[PDB]
């Protein structure tokens, strides 16, 4: 019954979402029992997942339940679920934080008019992310790549009455589709070749055609690259760096939703679930070393050049992912095993913490700035404020590394793995990695104690009502302590399990090119719109016109004057004899 | 094993028929404002 945890937030999305489209006069009044409804089913979804996580490692490890999806003559498609430690751990990294966003957004959105629709999105968003982490096939990671990408379009375009989030939500879907375009070619390329869709089949079937020679290793070189086109177009790189700037053009817990538990649950999981595909081609590992190092450079070098904590923290998600492709780029995935689960444990604890900084400043946001969501304009969140600025201390410091805290074991083995794999290309990363710890400390100093402008102490729907830019004293949300009681101890409980190479969860769980193309495809669209039609509407201009002008041309054969009619009768008599003797 | 279309098409068909007969009664905007009027695309 382990397939129930995908469908249980999905059942929460169909029950709630049908209530809006059919019962709008009642569901908009039942905003509070609806919000606690999916938060019950997600808490149910944890209650089946932690047992599937804790009581699977050091216990009954393997599980593969399959159900046939499509069928033909000697062509079967299967779709089911697996319970693997590489899969069961990946539940807890997302099923906890999906419970965390719906707790945090419950306190954020209180006067929001579209209140019930937001939790209906996260219901379907969480169910789509809980689907592909148990997925055994490349098809079932391509069932839920767009289903995650659809809610990522729906959550950015949540406030549909804002045109800044309108065009941001569409291009977030298209840039997710050009990675999905490669993943679709990545399936059918490796299904023409291997004939299987499971990685247990493709663990043997792939290399049997490479070392022998029925397919060239350069032919499969682009094919494993085409699968890798998925996670790089979903992270705003030098193909199209347009995705992650859209992460802070909508609601505030979307950075915790789509910029914290999507690139780690799709970009990091898929390159780890496909171990026997990348490991057997040395022409692929040199490209995930190339493209993996540059996105750590491209994410960091644009993040210092920023006047806001909105995009620069989202640019930190690009650059910290640049030290996750090197978790597979060097082969030693155990250095990425610690930052597999901790990229949403105390990293998202800042991503929920930084959202509460710009939320308890002025009140509701007009479009961009009216809730004071900009840096270099206000300061003083550590002088006199609530506990929401105290998770800005421990949730920011331990990433560079503190020897008592966790995260010190995160950034030592990722250089310790490249010291044993490829120490000739280490200097290009350490010139960044020594500086990505520097400017992330500037995120602490320029957002907690700085040049103040006004009294930004409250009004994140946490103080009393009618507090537009009027917040003298502080007010802690009731949905802030239970965030700080769960994932804080889990940032220490997972900081001892899977931290070193020999630990608990280490062995038991072992730029404008799109805009140059969207303006490029729009050029050939207007030219092709009247090209092939007008060569057949020229036939309409020929044939539909020469039929009428023949009938207007043969009309003048009838001209009256029946003496002429006696000619054509008698010329036919003269003409049909010479037709019949010849 | 395979879920067959016949026991679920036969189940949903009287659900389908008596709902179109009901949902014809519940309607708005095609009887009160109706600036399209007698037409359908004018």
């Amino acid at each position: 019954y382990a397939w129930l945890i995908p469908v249980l937030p999905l059942l929460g999305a169909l029950i709630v979402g049908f209530g809006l489209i059919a019962f709008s006069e009642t569901t908009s009044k039942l905003r509070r029992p609806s919000a606690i409804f999916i938060m019950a089913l997600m808490a149910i979804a944890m209650g089946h997942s932690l047992t599937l996580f804790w009581s699977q490692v050091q216990g009954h490890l393997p599980y593969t339940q399959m159900i046939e999806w499509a069928a033909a003559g000697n062509l079967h498609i299967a779709m089911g679920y697996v319970i693997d430690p590489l899969a069961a751990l990946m539940l807890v990294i997302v099923t906890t934080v999906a419970f965390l966003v719906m707790l945090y957004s419950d306190g954020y959105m209180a006067h929001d008019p579209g209140y019930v629709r937001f939790f209906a999105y996260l219901s379907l968003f969480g169910s789509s992310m809980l689907g592909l982490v148990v997925s055994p096939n490349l098809v079932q990671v391509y069932i839920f790549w767009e289903l995650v990408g659809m809610c990522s379009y729906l959550l950015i375009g949540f406030w549909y009455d804002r045109k800044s989030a309108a065009e941001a939500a569409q291009k977030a879907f298209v840039t997710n589709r050009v990675g999905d375009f490669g993943l679709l070619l990545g399936m059918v390329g490796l299904f023409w070749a291997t004939g299987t869709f499971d990685f247990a089949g493709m663990g043997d079937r792939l290399t049997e055609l490479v070392n022998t020679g029925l397919l060239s290793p350069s032919l499969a070189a682009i094919l494993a690259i085409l699968v890798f086109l998925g996670p790089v177009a979903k992270s705003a790189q030098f193909p199209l760096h347009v995705w992650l700037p859209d992460a802070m053009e909508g609601p505030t817990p979307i950075s915790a939703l789509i910029h914290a538990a999507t690139m780690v649950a799709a970009g990091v999981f898929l390159i780890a679930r496909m171990f026997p595909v990348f490991e057997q081609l040395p022409q692929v590992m040199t490209t995930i070393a190339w493209t993996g190092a540059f996105t750590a450079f491209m994410g960091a070098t644009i993040a210092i050049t920023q006047n806001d904590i909105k995009k620069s923290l989202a640019y930190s998600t690009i650059s910290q992912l640049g030290y996750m492709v090197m978790g597979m780029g060097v082969g030693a995935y155990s250095a990425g095993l610690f930052h597999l689960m901790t990229h949403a444990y105390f990293k998202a604890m800042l991503f929920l913490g930084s959202g509460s900084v710009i939320h308890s400043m002025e009140g509701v946001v007009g479009h961009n700035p009216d809730l004071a969501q900009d840096m270099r304009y206000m300061g003083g969140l550590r002088k006199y404020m609530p506990i929401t600025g105290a998770t800005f201390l421990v949730g920011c410091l331990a990433i560079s590394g503190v020897p008592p805290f966790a995260g010190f074991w995160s950034k030592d083995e990722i250089l310790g793995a490249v010291f044993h794999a490829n120490p000739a290309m280490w200097l290009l990363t350490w010139l960044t990695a020594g500086l990505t710890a520097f400017y992330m400390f500037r995120m602490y100093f320029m957002t907690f104690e700085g040049k103040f402008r006004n009294v930004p102490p409250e009004r994140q729907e946490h103080h009393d009502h009618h507090s537009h830019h009027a917040a003298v004293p502080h007010e802690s949300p009731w949905t802030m302590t239970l965030p700080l009681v769960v994932l804080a101890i889990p940032s220490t409980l997972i900081g001892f399990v899977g931290t070193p190479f020999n630990n608990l969860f280490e062995v038991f769980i072992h730029e404008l090119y799109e805009a140059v193309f969207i303006k490029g495809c729009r050029r050939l669209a207007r030219q092709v719109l009247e090209v092939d039609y007008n060569v057949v509407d020229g036939v309409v201009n020929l044939t539909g016109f020469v039929t009428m002008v023949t009938g207007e041309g043969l009309k003048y054969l009838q001209n009256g004057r029946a003496q002429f009619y006696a000619l054509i009768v008698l010329l036919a008599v003269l003409g049909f004899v010479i037709f019949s003797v010849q | 094993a395979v879920i067959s279309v016949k026991p679920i098409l036969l189940a949903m068909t009287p659900v389908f028929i008596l709902l179109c007969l009901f949902f014809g009664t519940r309607n708005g905007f095609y009887d009160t404002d109706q600036y399209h009027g007698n037409g359908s695309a004018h």
Binding site: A22, L147, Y160, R522 | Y30
Partner: protein, 504 residues
């Protein structure tokens, strides 16, 4: 199993349409005659279910509701109906959408006596295309929906009505004659004068003779299923139409060209299909590329979806000309998916035009602020077209992609350049749909709100039709064996018959 089932299903809405001129109470607009069309529409679909859930008996090939009567023995034409696994999904689809096409025809009070006549005569005449196993009844039924669709366009339609309906009837009648030319060519080949579709399949035709008949059917079926050089009637006849006329044209009428490609070009003519298959998949690829670029370059919303219907048609044409049991099963699934998907979009385009009265899409913007439920249903149907998984637009396209580049019939450098080019429509479909989704509802800046679009609402009846269309859209997208179980008995025999001619 002795009652005439398909003969009743064909001839009930034709006969019941004759009581439409005799319906009493003409209280201004036609209210009881609107209910009478839904009466004999719904109970006609109930017979399609009752003949399916009792006397279909699937996982066997051949016809299963067979009734071969005698009409004119002097010619040799018989009233021969019969439903196999190629006919029966589209026969079930025709009864399903036309029950909703009557239910979406409820603002039609212009000439309601004439309207629900020609819509019920197009209900019996559309089922009659997939059901008949004959030639001169097939050409009869193909041209049976010729006048009851001219008059549907030319009366209830936008501006440029009469240009659209006249261009339609000349392309349709002017290419239906090639069904008569080719259907008579096959029945007089050799010594047997049989006009049955099953007897004409087993006849042995020469390869030079078959290439004439294949070119005869391809101009006949490239018009109705719009193969892209013969497609120009489609955005005119769909650019000036209403929403109930749309779901019969996009949902049903385009599928008769795709259905007859599997009957009279693959079963009857396999040896010419081996020679004219690579031209189809290039034509199917440039069907997807051209229509998606032309959809993005268009401002009319009703013509934007009209060109979008040409793109999803291209995945049928790739899947037929691939010689795979999964390629053919993705070709028939693309007919049933787009029939439900294109009916749902075109109903909502007619629902948005009934409020905004513009169809210009530069004169709109911010409509979704006023009406919320039509916007909620417009995205759920637009995302259906995007081949988004969890819905039947994906699995129909997924079987075509997989079923093409696993076939032992083409070369590897030809299979790479097709699946690369046919997957550009994976990128190109969120280009025009989501922008049209953006340039209509997503907006603070609204319209003039004075001349047109003074009202805004969302009826519960209009929600129900989209809700009924999304149950098979999602339900096949979550389990495509709910519809493949009808195919595989017959498409297993269609490809295996075409497998014998493949070493060429």
């Amino acid at each position: 199993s002795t009652f005439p089932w398909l003969t009743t299903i064909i001839l009930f809405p034709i006969v019941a349409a004759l009581a439409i001129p005799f319906i009493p109470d003409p209280t201004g607009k036609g209210r009881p005659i609107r209910w009478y069309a839904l009466a004999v529409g719904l109970i006609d679909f109930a017979l399609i279910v009752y003949a399916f859930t009792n006397f279909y008996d699937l996982n066997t090939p051949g016809m299963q509701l067979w009734e071969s009567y005698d009409w004119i023995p002097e010619i040799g034409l018989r009233w021969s109906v019969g439903a196999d696994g190629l006919s029966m999904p589209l026969i079930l689809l025709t009864g399903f959408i036309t029950t909703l096409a009557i239910l979406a025809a409820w603002p039609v009070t212009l000439k309601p006596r004439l309207f629900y006549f020609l819509m019920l005569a197009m209900y019996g005449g559309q089922i009659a295309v997939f059901a008949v196993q004959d030639m001169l009844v097939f050409f009869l039924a193909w041209e049976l929906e010729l006048i009851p669709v001219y008059l549907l366009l030319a009366i209830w339609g936008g501006h440029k009505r009469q240009y659209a309906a006249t261009k339609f009837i000349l392309y349709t009648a002017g290419s239906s004659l090639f069904i008569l030319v080719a259907g008579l060519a096959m029945a007089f080949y050799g010594d047997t004068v049989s006009f049955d579709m099953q007897t004409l399949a087993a006849k042995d035709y020469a390869l030079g003779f078959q290439l004439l008949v294949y070119a005869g059917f391809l101009v006949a079926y490239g018009v109705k299923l719009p193969i892209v050089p013969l497609h120009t009637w489609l955005p005119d006849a769909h650019g000036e139409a209403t929403a109930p006329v749309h779901m019969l044209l996009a949902g049903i009428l385009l599928k008769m060209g795709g259905y007859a490609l599997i009957r009279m070009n693959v079963d009857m003519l396999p040896a010419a299909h081996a020679k004219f298959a690579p031209v189809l998949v290039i034509l199917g690829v440039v069907n997807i590329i051209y229509a998606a670029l032309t959809s993005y370059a268009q401002r009319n919303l009703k013509r934007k979806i009209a060109y979008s219907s040409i793109s999803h048609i291209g995945f049928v044409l790739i899947g037929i000309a691939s010689f795979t049991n999964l390629g053919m099963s993705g070709a028939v699934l693309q007919m049933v998916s787009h029939g439900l998907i294109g009916a749902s979009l075109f109903f909502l385009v007619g629902a948005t035009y009934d409020r905004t009265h513009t169809l210009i899409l530069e004169e709109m913007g911010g409509v979704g602020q006023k009406m919320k439920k039509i916007f909620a249903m417009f995205t759920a149907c637009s995302l259906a077209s995007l081949a988004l998984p969890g819905m039947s637009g994906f699995v129909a396209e997924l079987m075509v992609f997989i079923g093409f580049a696993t076939s032992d019939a083409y070369s590897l450098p030809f299979r790479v350049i097709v699946v690369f080019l046919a997957a550009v429509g994976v990128i190109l479909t969120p280009i025009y749909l989501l922008s049209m989704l953006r340039e209509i509802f997503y907006g603070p800046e609204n319209k003039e709100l004075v001349e047109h679009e003074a009202l805004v609402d969302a009826e519960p009846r209009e929600v129900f039709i989209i809700a009924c269309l999304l149950v098979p859209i999602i339900g096949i997208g979550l389990y495509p064996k709910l519809l493949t179980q009808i195919y595989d008995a017959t498409t297993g025999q269609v490809i295996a018959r075409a497998r014998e001619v493949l070493p060429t």
